[PDB]
Amino acid sequence: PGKATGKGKPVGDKWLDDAGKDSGAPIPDRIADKLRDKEFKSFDDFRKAVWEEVSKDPELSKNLNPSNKSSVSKGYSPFTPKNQQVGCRKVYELHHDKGEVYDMDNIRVTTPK
């Protein structure tokens, strides 16, 4: 278990487009605000909370279509464009930039490719 920490970064409407780029996308600052100091039993529980918070934030979720909205509403990761998928990895991932497990300044949202 662990407490989530860190600040994240300001992001724009199309922030998941950056997840496809070489940096990846940061955890949005608004999400970091919501999860900071919260306790999580595992990285999977933290990941669920990130996507649930994305689903609740009209600005971070507005560029997801209704099918993708359904996914994040359940705390599931949204599906990437087909050309960013590999193997059975078809959804956005949370990678550590590497270094603490729940440090949101150390986590990047990425596509599989």
Binding site: N65, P66, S67, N68, S70, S71, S73, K74, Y76, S77, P78, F79, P81, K82, Q85, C88, K90, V91
Partner: protein
């Protein structure tokens, strides 16, 4: 049920609804269902039909099924079970 021709159009639409509503048993079941949609349709856009649809048709399970039905027919492929 093994290929798309084992499904009626109603059954296939209920399956697309399941995917669109994220109503698999778990997140990994949703992933399997998306991959199964890809296998069954053989459509080269795959999951983009569900999540990243072209803007000249409706973004809904109806619209997705319409696109698949039309694409399979126009490309000489088998269709839904009667």
């Amino acid at each position: 049920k093994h290929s798309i021709s084992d499904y009626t159009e109603a059954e296939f639409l209920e399956f697309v609804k399941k995917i669109a509503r994220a109503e698999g048993a778990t997140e990994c079941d949703d992933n399997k269902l998306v991959r199964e949609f890809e296998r069954l349709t053989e459509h080269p856009d795959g999951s983009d039909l569900i999540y990243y649809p072209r803007d000249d048709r409706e973004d809904s399970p109806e619209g997705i099924v319409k696109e698949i039905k039309e694409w399979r027919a126009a490309n000489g492929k088998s269709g839904f079970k009667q």
